[PDB]
Design a protein around this ligand. Sequence first.
Ligand SMILES: O=c1ccn([C@@H]2O[C@H](CO)[C@@H](O)[C@H]2O)c(=O)[nH]1
Ligand SMILES: O=c1ccn([C@@H]2O[C@H](CO)[C@@H](O)[C@H]2O)c(=O)[nH]1
Ligand SMILES: O=c1ccn([C@@H]2O[C@H](CO)[C@@H](O)[C@H]2O)c(=O)[nH]1
Ligand SMILES: O=c1ccn([C@@H]2O[C@H](CO)[C@@H](O)[C@H]2O)c(=O)[nH]1
Ligand SMILES: O=c1ccn([C@@H]2O[C@H](CO)[C@@H](O)[C@H]2O)c(=O)[nH]1
Ligand SMILES: O=c1ccn([C@@H]2O[C@H](CO)[C@@H](O)[C@H]2O)c(=O)[nH]1
Ligand SMILES: [Cl-]
Ligand SMILES: [Cl-]
Ligand SMILES: [Cl-]
Ligand SMILES: [Cl-]
Ligand SMILES: [Cl-]
Ligand SMILES: [Cl-]
Ligand code: NA
Ligand code: NA
Lengths: 249, 251, 251, 251, 252, 251
Amino acid sequence: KTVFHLGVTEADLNGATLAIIPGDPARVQKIAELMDNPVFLASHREYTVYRAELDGQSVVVCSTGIGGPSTSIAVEELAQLGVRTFLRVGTTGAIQPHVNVGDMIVTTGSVRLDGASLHFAPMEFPAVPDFDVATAMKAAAQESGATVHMGVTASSDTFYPGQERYDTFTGRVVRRFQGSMKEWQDMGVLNFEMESATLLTMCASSGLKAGCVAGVIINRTQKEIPATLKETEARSIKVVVEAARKMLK
Amino acid sequence: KTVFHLGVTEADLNGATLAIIPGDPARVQKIAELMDNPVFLASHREYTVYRAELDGQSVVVCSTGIGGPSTSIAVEELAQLGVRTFLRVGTTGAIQPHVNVGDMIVTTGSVRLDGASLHFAPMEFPAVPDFDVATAMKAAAQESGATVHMGVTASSDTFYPGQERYDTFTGRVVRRFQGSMKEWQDMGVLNFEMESATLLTMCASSGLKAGCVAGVIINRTQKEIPDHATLKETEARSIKVVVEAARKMLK
Amino acid sequence: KTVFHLGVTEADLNGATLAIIPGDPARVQKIAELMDNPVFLASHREYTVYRAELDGQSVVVCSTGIGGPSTSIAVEELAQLGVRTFLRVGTTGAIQPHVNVGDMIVTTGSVRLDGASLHFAPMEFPAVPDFDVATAMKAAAQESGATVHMGVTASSDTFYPGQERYDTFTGRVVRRFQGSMKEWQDMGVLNFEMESATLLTMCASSGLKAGCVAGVIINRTQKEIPDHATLKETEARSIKVVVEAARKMLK
Amino acid sequence: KTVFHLGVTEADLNGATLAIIPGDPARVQKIAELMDNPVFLASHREYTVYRAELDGQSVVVCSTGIGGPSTSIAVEELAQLGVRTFLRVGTTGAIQPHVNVGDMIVTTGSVRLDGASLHFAPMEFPAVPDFDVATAMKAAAQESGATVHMGVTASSDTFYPGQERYDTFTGRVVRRFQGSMKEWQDMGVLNFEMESATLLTMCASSGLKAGCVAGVIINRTQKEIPDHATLKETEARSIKVVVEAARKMLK
Amino acid sequence: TKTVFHLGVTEADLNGATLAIIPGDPARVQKIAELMDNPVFLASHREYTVYRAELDGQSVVVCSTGIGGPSTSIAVEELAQLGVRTFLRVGTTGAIQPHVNVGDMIVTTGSVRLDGASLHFAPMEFPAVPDFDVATAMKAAAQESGATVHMGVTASSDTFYPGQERYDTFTGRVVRRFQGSMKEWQDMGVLNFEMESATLLTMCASSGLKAGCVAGVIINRTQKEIPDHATLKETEARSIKVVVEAARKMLK
Amino acid sequence: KTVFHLGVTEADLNGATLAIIPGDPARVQKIAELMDNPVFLASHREYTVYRAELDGQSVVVCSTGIGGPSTSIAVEELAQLGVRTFLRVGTTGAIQPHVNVGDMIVTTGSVRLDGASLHFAPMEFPAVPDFDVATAMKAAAQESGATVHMGVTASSDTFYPGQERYDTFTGRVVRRFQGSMKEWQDMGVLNFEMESATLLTMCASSGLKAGCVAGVIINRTQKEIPDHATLKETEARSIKVVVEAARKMLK
Ligand SMILES: O=c1ccn([C@@H]2O[C@H](CO)[C@@H](O)[C@H]2O)c(=O)[nH]1
Ligand SMILES: O=c1ccn([C@@H]2O[C@H](CO)[C@@H](O)[C@H]2O)c(=O)[nH]1
Ligand SMILES: O=c1ccn([C@@H]2O[C@H](CO)[C@@H](O)[C@H]2O)c(=O)[nH]1
Ligand SMILES: O=c1ccn([C@@H]2O[C@H](CO)[C@@H](O)[C@H]2O)c(=O)[nH]1
Ligand SMILES: O=c1ccn([C@@H]2O[C@H](CO)[C@@H](O)[C@H]2O)c(=O)[nH]1
Ligand SMILES: O=c1ccn([C@@H]2O[C@H](CO)[C@@H](O)[C@H]2O)c(=O)[nH]1
Ligand SMILES: [Cl-]
Ligand SMILES: [Cl-]
Ligand SMILES: [Cl-]
Ligand SMILES: [Cl-]
Ligand SMILES: [Cl-]
Ligand SMILES: [Cl-]
Ligand code: NA
Ligand code: NA
C-alpha cells in the first residue's frame, strides 16, 4: 500500500505507469515543471517524488541518488505501485574524441562495472534498454537539434578509480581498472556514468521497460571545460520529457 | 589478397560493405537467389560465399556454420575485405509460451553463454546489436506481416546441456545449467540460439554493425516438434525478412 | 569548492581529521547537535555536511547516501580534505536469533556483496575495520549500557534480492542469492547492511581508518518488527554511541 | 532411432562404436578412402558422414566443423547412436620454436580457452584424453616416422584474438589474451587449435573415450597465416596416422 | 570415546581443553608446551605433533599444523570434534612494508585470500577475519614483549615462491596473476606475507570458532628474497612467548 | 647454495635427477630402504630427505606433507638442485563403487579443487601428468599384480568439506561442495586426494616431469576405516610400485 523508502502510495501516483528518474533530487522539480499539473508528493533521504501529467496521463518523477544500490530501491518500489516504464536522464563523461561537450548520448548497452546488476541477473545477461524506450529517446534527442550518439556506456560503481581518475588522495587505481579507459575507447565505448548497468539489467530481467539518455558535461580526452554548462542540463531534461511524450501519446 | 578460410579476395566482393550471414551453407544460395545477379564465389569447409546485388549495390552472403568460433572467422575475414555490416539470419527455440512457431525474433541483447565473445570483450560488456540494424530488422519483419518479437536471446555454446535438454546420451546437465531455462523464462528471455552472443559482442567492440533475426522453429514449452511444411516455410519467411532488412540498411 | 560533490574546502572543516558518516542526510544534524558548536557547511544531492567540536577538536559529519557508490565519493573527497578517520553509524537487520532489536553491532569484517569495493581491491582482500576504530566503537557501545555484538556483517548492493527479500514486484531472487541468508546464518554472520563492505575495503586499502557500528532495527530471522518508540530509542542510542566512539579516538 | 543434425540412423552405422572426427568435411572422404568398404551416408551443414571398416569392424567418419559448439553436436549425436570412442584429427599451429611444420602432436591435456567445455564440466575439471586412445595415437604417430610430440595444447574458441593473432581488421587483442602466447610458451604448451578442449572435457566427463592428434601446418614463431604448399603433405600424414590409431584401438 | 583420523588423540587426552595453540612447525610444539604448566606429550603423526599443558589452571592443546591451509584445516577440524573452540596460531612471516623490521610481531586483523582451502568454508566475498577477542589478547601479549607490534592486513598465500612473487627460483617465472602483486599489496598497506591465516580465519570465522594469528618478522622483502639464519631463533623465542601470553589472557 | 626448507645441497643429491615424493615423512625411509645405499640427508618440518640408488643412479626420496602448499615448496627446492622428474605415491579415497581398497590409481588428470595450482597456471590449464611417467606407473602397477585404474582424480585443498564429508564438527558443507561427490561420480572421477592438482599443474607448466600413483585406503560408497593389516598391505604395494616405476624411468 505504502512503500518503505519513497513514502508514497499507489493512490498518490494516480494511475501513472511511466517514471522519469534523474539522479539529483534537485532535478525532480525542474523536470516536473516541464509537464502539466506538477504536484509535490514526498521527499525522504535522496528520494524526491513528484506527480505530473503529459498528454492527459500521469507520470511520476523520482530521483535515484548516486549509484545502482539507491537506484534499485527506487525502481523496485515504484514498480510495486504500478509503474512499468522508466526513463533515466543524467550527466556523463565522454571518452571518445569525436564526442562533444553538449552532445546527448542514448545508451544501447552498458558495460557492467557495477555490483547491483548481479543482484538481478548473472554477469552474462545483457544490460540492454527496452527497444521502444531507446527508440523514443533517440527521436527526442535528435528533435532537440543537438548531436546525438547511440551506443555503449561504461557504467561504474565509483566516480573515481573505476573511471580511471588518478587525481585522488592515493593516486592509485587497482589493476582491473589500470588502462581500462583506453580499452573501452578501443572497443568504441562512448561514455562513463554510474546508474545504467543496474537500471537496465534489473529492468530487462524483471519485466520492465527502461532507457538512459545523458548530456555530455565533460570529455575525458581533452579534459578542458568551456563554463556555461547549465544549458546541457536544460537540454537533457527537455529531451527526457519529450521521450516520455512519445512513450505515452 | 585471399583470406585464409573464406578463399575470396577484395575484388570478389566487388565493393560490398554489407553481409547476410546464415549458419547453414544450404541457405547461402537461396538468399542470393532473391537478389539480383547471384554469383557464386567459394565453398570451403562450412563457408559458402555468394555475391549478389541489391538496389545496384553488391551484397555478400556467407554461411557461418554452427557456433561462435566459426562465425568469428567469417566476420573477421569479411571485415578484412571491407565489410562493415552483418545481418545474421538463423533459427531458434522459443522459451516463452506466447511466442509461436513461425514468429520472428529480433535480438536486442544476448546472454553470453558462449566462449568466443570473451575473446573480444570481457563478460561485463553487453552483447548488443547495432541500433540501425536492429531497427531495420524490426521494420522488415513487420512489413512482411509476421508476428515479430523484440527481446533478449540466450546464446549458448551447446545445443544440448547449455539449452537444458535432458533427452541425451547421458541425460545429465551440469550444475551451472540445471534449472537454467526456467531462470531465463522468469527473466523474460525469448529464445535460445548459438551464434548471437559472439557476433554481437565481437561487432560492438570492433567498429562493425550487426544484428540477428531468427525464425522460431520450435517452442520448448510444447513437447511436440513442428512439421516439415512449417520448417521450410519458416526458413522461407526468415530469408525474405533478412533481405528486406538488408535493403533498408543500404539506403 | 575544492572537491566535486561535497562543495566544501579543507578550511571549512577547521582541522577535522575524523568524520562521522551516517547514511541519512536527516541524521547529520542530530549527530552534530550532540556535540559542541554545530555548524551547517553544505548540502548537495545526498551529501549534507556539518562540523562541530568534541572536547575542543573539530569533527566533520557527512551523509553517505544509500550504497557503496555514493559512500565512496564522500570518503574520497573528505580524504582529499585531510580526513583520515571514518566512523560509520547505521541501522541494520539482524539474522541471528540471539541478536535482538535494540542491540548494537560492531562490524569486524564484511561479506563483500557489493561492487564498489572491487574498485579499490580484488575480491580476496578483506573488508575489515581499523582495529583502533573497532575497539573504540566496542568500548563506546558497552559504556552505553547496550548489548553489543562483535562480528561479520553481510554488506549488500541491494536492499531487496541481495538481502533475500521476496516481498517484491517479481517475487524473484537470482540463483546467487537464493538460500544466501540461510548460508549466512549457518556461517554465524550477524546482520545485513549496505555500505560497510565498500567503506572498509576502500579505507583498509587506502591508508585510512574506518569502523562501522549499527543499531538493530529488525531481526529478519525472528520477524521482530518494532514500535516507532523502539525504532526511535535505537536510533538515539546509535548516534550517541558513535559520538562517544569519536571521543575515544581523539588525541 | 534417429538424430537432429547428422541425418543418420543407428542402422546406418552398422554397429560402429568408434568414430574418426576430422574438422573439415572435405577430409571425411579422404580418411574413409584409407579404410575398407567406405560408404557415403549423409551430408548436412558442416556434417558429412561416411561408414567404413578396419579389421572387419565398422567405423564412422564424421566431420565436426570448426569449433566446440559444432563438435559437441556431432559427438552427442554419435553417442546417442552407440559410438563410444572419438578420435579427432586436425591441423594445428605450433608455438614452441623446436616444433617443425609436418610434425605430429598428440594432446595429453588442453588449456580450456573455449566455452562449450563449461557446458559439461566446471573449469577445474581437466581436459584430458582417454589414456588408451592417447597411447594408440602416440604409437600410430611414431610409426609414420614424422617427429611426434606429446604435450599440452591451448584450445581456443577463436582463430584470431584467442590465438593472439594481430594481423587483423582491428589489430586489437583483449586484455586476457594480450600476452597469452608468451605465457603458454613459457609454460611449455606445444600448440594451438580450436576443438580439443571441448572434445576432451565432454568425453572425459561423460563416459566416452577420446583423443586428439594434429599435423603441424604452421609454426607461430614464424608467421600468422598458413601457406598452401604445406597443407597437402601434412594432411596426408595426419589422416594415415589417425586411421592407424583407430586400427590399434579396435583389436 | 572418539579418536580422530589424523591427530590420533582422544577427547579424554585433551582433559577438557577448549583452547589450542597451533604453530606451523612440529619442532615448536614441545618448545611452546614447555613454557606452560605440566606439559605432556600426547601423539605425533605426519606433520601433527600434539601435546597437552595447563595454563592458569586450565587444559590447553599444542598442535602443529604443518605448512599451508590444507594441513591446517585438518588439524583445526579434528581438534574441534574433540571440543576445542579457540585457536591461536603462531608463525613466521615476511615483511613487505619498509618500516617493519626483522624481530617485530604482526597481529593479523584480516587476510588477503590467496589460498584455496578458505573457499571450502566460505565463498571469496566472506572476510578472513580474526575473532576480535583473540586479536585483542594477541595485541596485548605482543606489546607485553617489548617488540614493536603491528596490526594490519596479511597476504596469505598458497605458495612460498610465485604467490609471494619470489623470482629467484628454478624457472624465474611468475604467472600473470602474481606479476607485480607485491607492489600492489605494498600500495594497499598490506604488511606481510604468510601461508596459513586465510584458511584458518575464514574457516573459524564461518564455523563458530575463535581464531587469530600472530607472527614474528623473519625477513623484509624490500631487502632480500630468502630469510637469514641469525635472526631465526631470537625471533622464534619471542614469538612463542607472545602466543603463550595471549592464551593466558584468553583463558582468565 | 643450500635450499631454505629442505636443508640439503646439490652435493647431497649426488647427481640425482629423479625424486620419489610421498606425503607422509614416515614413508621416506621405507621407500629408500627398498633401493641401494640409502642415506639419510635431512629432516626439517614435514620434509624428510633421503638419497638412495637404483640401477647405479642416485634417486632422491622426499616427503611433501599434506596439501599443495607444502608440496610446492618441496618440488621447487628439489628442482633448484637439478631434480626434473617427480613421482608421487600417496593414499586415496575412491568414489566409484567398483574400486576396492587395496587397488592402485594412476592419475591421468586432476580436478583442480586446490589453490596452489593457480599460482603456476590459471584455472583453464590442464592438471595432467607427464605421459612417460604415467606410462611407467601403469606398467609398474600391472606387472606387480595389483589392480590399476587409469583416470581423473579430484584433488582437494581440504580433507573434509572439499571431499563432501558431513560427519564433522558442524555438519556444514559450503554451497560450492554441496552435491559435488555425486557430480564427480556421475562424470567418472575415480578418487579424492589432496596433492595431485598442485603437483601436476606446477610441473606441467614448469618443464618438469611428474605423475601420481595412490593406494586406495578408503571408498566413499562404503565409509569404513580399514584394518591395520589392509592399510599396511596397501602401503607396501604402493611403495613397491613407485620404486618399480622410478626404475622404468631410468632404464
Ligand atoms: O564523467 C562523469 C560524469 C558524470 N557522471 C555522473 O555523475 C554522477 C555523480 O556526480 C553520477 O550519478 C554519474 O552518473 C559520472 O559518473 N562520470
Ligand atoms: O532450439 C534451437 C533451435 C535452433 N537453434 C539454432 O540452430 C542451429 C543448429 O541447428 C544453431 O545455429 C542455433 O543457432 C538453437 O540453438 N536452438
Ligand atoms: O535490514 C536492513 C536494515 C537496514 N539497512 C540499512 O538501511 C538503509 C536502507 O534504507 C541502508 O542504507 C542499509 O544500510 C539494510 O540495508 N537492511
Ligand atoms: O594455427 C592454427 C592452425 C590450425 N587451427 C585449426 O584450424 C581449423 C580451422 O582452420 C580449426 O579447426 C583449428 O583446430 C588453429 O586453430 N590454429
Ligand atoms: O617470507 C615468508 C616468511 C615466512 N613464511 C612462513 O614460512 C612457513 C614455511 O617456511 C610458512 O608457514 C609461512 O607461513 C612465509 O610464507 N613467507
Ligand atoms: O579419502 C581420502 C583418503 C586419502 N586422502 C589423502 O590422505 C592424505 C591425508 O591423510 C592426503 O595426503 C590425501 O592425499 C584424501 O585426501 N582423501
Ligand atoms: Cl542526475
Ligand atoms: Cl544512517
Ligand atoms: Cl580438420
Ligand atoms: Cl611456524
Ligand atoms: Cl602419503
Ligand atoms: Cl559423510
Ligand atoms: Na562450425
Ligand atoms: Na603441510
